[PDB]
């Protein structure tokens, strides 16, 4: 039944396995340094995290 279907051929590159930790959005993800935010949420929270504009 359930085990006859699940976990048969590995999906090693799941885009749908990742989401923004603030709004749970699929797109515009920033996985660098482990932010795991979408780019809009990062722009909203960039100053609080510690990233600030200099150049």
């Amino acid at each position: 039944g359930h085990q006859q279907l699940y976990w048969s051929h590995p999906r090693k590159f799941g885009q749908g396995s990742r989401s923004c930790r603030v709004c749970s959005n699929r797109h515009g993800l920033i996985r660098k340094y482990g932010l795991n935010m979408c780019r809009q949420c990062f722009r909203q929270y960039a100053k609080d995290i510690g990233f600030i504009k200099l150049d």
Binding site: I30, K32, Y33, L35, R39, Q40, F42, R43, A46, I49, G50, F51, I52, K53, L54, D55
Partner: protein
């Protein structure tokens, strides 16, 4: 071994240098030989993102920066002295790491 290292990391240089000077002064108040503060190359974290939430307008980007400054001071003293000098009501942001290696 009696070689103990303290590694100081913060995103700003004012507080990190203040803490470094404080700890050097503290280790020199007692008669202790101290290896001068050694500065790592201050790795810079960059995140460049489109400014727009949509995909409209002139392609404009934000260039976000985050610089991490790393200093390590070497001196020879037991753990009690290090624990006492750590409890100094430290200023925020300067992450202190001590290793007995």
């Amino acid at each position: 071994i009696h070689r103990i290292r303290i590694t100081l990391t913060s995103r700003n240089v004012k507080s990190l240098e203040k803490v470094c000077a404080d700890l050097i002064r503290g280790a020199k108040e007692k008669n202790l030989k101290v290896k001068g503060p050694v500065r790592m190359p201050t790795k810079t974290l960059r995140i460049t993102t489109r400014k727009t939430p949509c995909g409209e307008g002139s392609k404009t980007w934000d260039r976000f920066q985050m610089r991490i400054h790393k200093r390590l001071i070497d001196l020879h003293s037991p753990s009690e002295i290090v624990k006492q000098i750590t409890s100094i009501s430290i200023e925020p942001g300067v992450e202190v790491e001590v290793t007995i290696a």
